Write a protein that binds this DNA or RNA. Sequence first.
DNA 1: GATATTTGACCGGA
DNA 2: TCCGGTCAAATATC
Length: 69
Amino acid sequence: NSVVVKNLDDGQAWRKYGQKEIQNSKHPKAYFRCTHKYDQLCTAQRQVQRCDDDPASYRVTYIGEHTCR
DNA sequence: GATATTTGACCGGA
DNA sequence: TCCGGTCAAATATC
Ligand SMILES: [Zn+2]
């Protein structure tokens, strides 16, 4: 999983999120995560609130849809 | 609007 | 309390 190369454009979509000096290393280490990391979140939400007009019932609000598997 | 990078802060683990 | 991995605010460039 580790390789030695001379240009960093591996054709993947990378996003830099940090850079650290490392003890006993001459050069900093850069950190990248996938640009698409969050593109497949399940964004479905639900809100629940007892009704003012009827405390025996709940208003349930559905926001978004499920994409989870 | 929105997303990218830089870079010191922050935190967990040893 | 040192080290290193991640976060996030500032900043950039469009
Ligand atoms: Zn990916």
